[PDB]
Structure formats: C-alpha cells, structure tokens
Amino acid sequence: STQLDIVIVLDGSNSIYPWDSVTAFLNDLLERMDIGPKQTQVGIVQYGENVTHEFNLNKYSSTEEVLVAAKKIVQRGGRQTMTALGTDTARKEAFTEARGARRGVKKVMVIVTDGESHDNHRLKKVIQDCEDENIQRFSIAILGSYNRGNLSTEKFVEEIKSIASEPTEKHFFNVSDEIALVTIVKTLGERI
Amino acid sequence: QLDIVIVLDGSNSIYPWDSVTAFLNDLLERMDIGPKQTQVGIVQYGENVTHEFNLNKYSSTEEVLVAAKKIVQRGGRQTMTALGIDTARKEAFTEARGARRGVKKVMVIVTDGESHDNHRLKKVIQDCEDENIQRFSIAILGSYNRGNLSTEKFVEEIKSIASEPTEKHFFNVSDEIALVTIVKTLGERI
Numbered sequence A: 001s002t003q004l005d006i007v008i009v010l011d012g013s014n015s016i017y018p019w020d021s022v023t024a025f026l027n028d029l030l031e032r033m034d035i036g037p038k039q040t041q042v043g044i045v046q047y048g049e050n051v052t053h054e055f056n057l058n059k060y061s062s063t064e065e066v067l068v069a070a071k072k073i074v075q076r077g078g079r080q081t082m083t084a085l086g087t088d089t090a091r092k093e094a095f096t097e098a099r100g101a102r103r104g105v106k107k108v109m110v111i112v113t114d115g116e117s118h119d120n121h122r123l124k125k126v127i128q129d130c131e132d133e134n135i136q137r138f139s140i141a142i143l144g145s146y147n148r149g150n151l152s153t154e155k156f157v158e159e160i161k162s163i164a165s166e167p168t169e170k171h172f173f174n175v176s177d178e179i180a181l182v183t184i185v186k187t188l189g190e191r192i
Numbered sequence B: 001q002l003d004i005v006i007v008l009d010g011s012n013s014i015y016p017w018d019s020v021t022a023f024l025n026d027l028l029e030r031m032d033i034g035p036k037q038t039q040v041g042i043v044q045y046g047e048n049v050t051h052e053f054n055l056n057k058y059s060s061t062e063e064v065l066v067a068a069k070k071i072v073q074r075g076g077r078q079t080m081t082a083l084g085i086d087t088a089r090k091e092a093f094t095e096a097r098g099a100r101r102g103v104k105k106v107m108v109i110v111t112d113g114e115s116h117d118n119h120r121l122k123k124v125i126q127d128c129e130d131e132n133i134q135r136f137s138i139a140i141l142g143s144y145n146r147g148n149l150s151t152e153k154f155v156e157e158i159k160s161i162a163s164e165p166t167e168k169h170f171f172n173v174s175d176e177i178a179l180v181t182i183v184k185t186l187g188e189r190i
C-alpha cells in the first residue's frame, strides 16, 4: 500500500505574483495529505539563482506542522531561473536519507515555474537522472507573467512538458495565471 | 525480519539476461537490507548450483545492488529446479551462510522451463513446507511461446512450487521483458 516522499520544487522568481497564490496552493495541496514518518513526507526546495531547502522530508511529522511551515515560505526572487539546478538539487539533496528520504518509498517531485530556464541545456540530463532514480515528476507551468508581458508561451510550454513524467497529459499542468494555481489542487492530489 | 533467498534459473533460453538483473535491481532496491533488517542471498542453478552470495555477505541495500548487477548468466541445458530449491533450503538457509535463527524464510524462484529433475519436486517441496519456507514462484513463458511449446504443464509445475494460496505466491510472466512489471506486486506481498 501507499507511502510517499514528496518534494515540491518552487521557482521563487519575482515574476510570480502575488506570492500568496503559491502559498495558498501549498496549503490546499498539503492539507489533503496524511503526513508522517509512516505515511507521506513532504520536503520543499525553492530556487531562483541558487537553491534553498525550506525544510527536509523528515523535518515535520504531522500535516498540522507542515501547513504552518508552508505558510511561512517567503518569495526569494532572483534574476535567473535555474530550474535544472533546482530539480537536480532536489534529486541529489532533498531525496537523500540524511534529509529524511525513506528506502523503498515512492518518490514524487512537483515543479512549479513561470518561465523558461536559463540552464535549460542541462534539463535533458537532469530529467533522465530523476527518471533513472524513479522520481515521478509533475510539472506546473504558470503562463501568467509571460501572457501579461505579451511573450509567446509555445516554447515555454514545451520545455515544462519535457520535465513531466509520462503520460505528459497527466503529469503536466498548464495554469493560465497565479490566481488559477489553487484550481488544480483537486486533480493533482488525485494523481500523486 | 526477513531472510530472502532468490533461486535463479540460469538456462541459456532466458534472454536477455539484463531482464533478470533488472528485475533483481528493481526488487531489491526497495528493501532495507542489513543484519537487523532484511537479508538477501542469491543462488543460481542450471545443471549445477552456485551461491552468488550468502545471506550475510552484504549488510546494506547499496552493496546488494552492486553485487546483483554483476551476476552473470551461467547457462545450462538441464534445468535442475528441484536441486536449486533443495540447495537453497539445506545450504543457503543455514546459520553458516548467514541465516538468522527465528527469522521468517522466504524463497523466490524464477525459471523459464520445466525441470529435468521433476520427479524430486514433491519431496523437495514437502521438505520446504516442513521447514516453513514461504515460496514465491515465477514462470517466464518467453522461450516456450517463442518455441511454440504448450505451457499448461509448465505452468502447473511452477504453481506446484509456490506456497498456497497459489494466487498470492505464483506469477505467470509472458516474457523476459515483462518480468519487471511484477516487482511492485511481489514486493508488496513479501
């Protein structure tokens, strides 16, 4: 039966606004989980230019504690968007026994971003490494800032889709804007 | 809490071998291996039997995984399943090779053909029953189907090796490349 190690990878770019929309997403997604050492564990990493572990997989042992922490996460911002670095760091550091990962438990990564990555040339390798380590990946593309800035989103969407596990349609979410993020909580939760 | 001995048919008809090592990797990487947790030993048989490694040879999952990938196919024409199972019972499951007193013994048998020492199965299996060894048996029908051979008799033989209820302990795998698909389910039942 179930058991789950979930690491949410958050793009802290300034373009994402309002930040309340992201924390609302975290709250609504996480409150529907049974969090504990013998159940689901959640770890959160935020990236911009560099990466920060907001908290490890075994930092909190109850849904209640996680919800309190999730709300405290502040937007770190950043010039460049290093999604490959964020994902790779999550694989290499977040999903390790030292930080709480559990032997034999299913691994799930949830990536939320609102732009193409400056280190997109690393994605091919980074994604394959996650795949070899059996990390199911759900990727979320927020088209808000791009649309508000009249930027074509075609390539952006293609890039974020490439991060999602197959079948893509089930692991990739095209979110029109920040305020619409909480809208996918029900579905994402049913698929994780 | 578990002493697991995997008994692998090494007969040349099984192809590609990477399919068997992929199965081992995927199955073993989900276990917590150690002298205080799960222990794994592997035996490979053909016309003869070889202990790839004893139950207490390794004390961690990572070590087991590195060793598992190194296991080479030894081949053979004769499929001495009875000998393989019997050797696992009286040799692999001994305190000398790492077996822990009081821990549950689990055997996982993987083969792609009827055994040439089939006349010994009833006796060998009964001895396993007497010693309380839970048995999971996996029949790969790859070579048989490719060779257009009937599989009814083959499947019945492998089912007879599995502990009851057969539904829980026996697995019918269409071909080598499909072996990896039972890892999840097998891992949950052990």
Ligand SMILES: [Mg+2]
Residues within 6 Å of the ligand: A013, A014, A015, A016, A081, A114, A115, A145
């Ligand atoms: Mg941005």
Ligand SMILES: [Mg+2]
Residues within 6 Å of the ligand: B011, B012, B013, B014, B079, B112, B113, B143
């Ligand atoms: Mg054979």
